[PDB]
Design a protein around this nucleic acid. Structure first.
Lengths: 57, 38, 37, 37
DNA sequence: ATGCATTTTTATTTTT
DNA sequence: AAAAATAAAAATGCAT
């Protein structure tokens, strides 16, 4: 249930559609966090910026 | 249950670059029109 | 719904290029004067 | 949330062009006036 | 996805 | 000798 959509012009939104997924990303009153989208944010940020640079360098 | 979905979003803005390019274009067209009389 | 965001905003510093091309225009026009006058 | 600004470079040769063209301007001024002598 | 709370079934202790 | 009352283990359900 991880998906993405072109929600606007030059705008793509990724979404984890499974209802409990926040409880996994952030942990809970009973569970440690097991973050899974944050570690990908750290990757795709770099790739996106450097590829947009390479479009103009 | 509750629908505690998560989002991540990637988006870009080109409209400023668009206008900067229009400004450069018309400056070079100025050169074009003076070179035509020269 | 927590939203993470990456924004990219695109720039060109054309204010130098404009001044260059305008300097070229103004330089060429001196020739036209020297020819005709 | 995060933003980055991404820059294109735009540039021109005109520093040589001025020197070259002004030399040609001076050429025309010179031989034009001398030809009247 | 990971876990906790309630219901049901069971083997043992105790009363009759 | 029967079987009422109980704690522990397994299954269903909801909770973050």
């Amino acid at each position: 249930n991880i998906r993405y959509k072109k929600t606007g012009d030059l705008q793509y939104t990724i979404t984890s559609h499974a209802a409990y997924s926040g409880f996994l990303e952030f942990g809970t009153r009973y569970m440690e966090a097991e973050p899974f989208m944050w570690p990908v944010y750290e990757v795709i940020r770099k790739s996106t910026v450097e590829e947009l640079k390479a479009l103009f360098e | 249950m509750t629908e505690y979905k998560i989002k991540a979003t990637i988006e870009a803005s080109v409209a400023k670059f668009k206008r900067q390019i229009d400004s450069a274009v018309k400056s070079v067209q100025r050169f074009k029109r003076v070179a035509d009389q020269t």
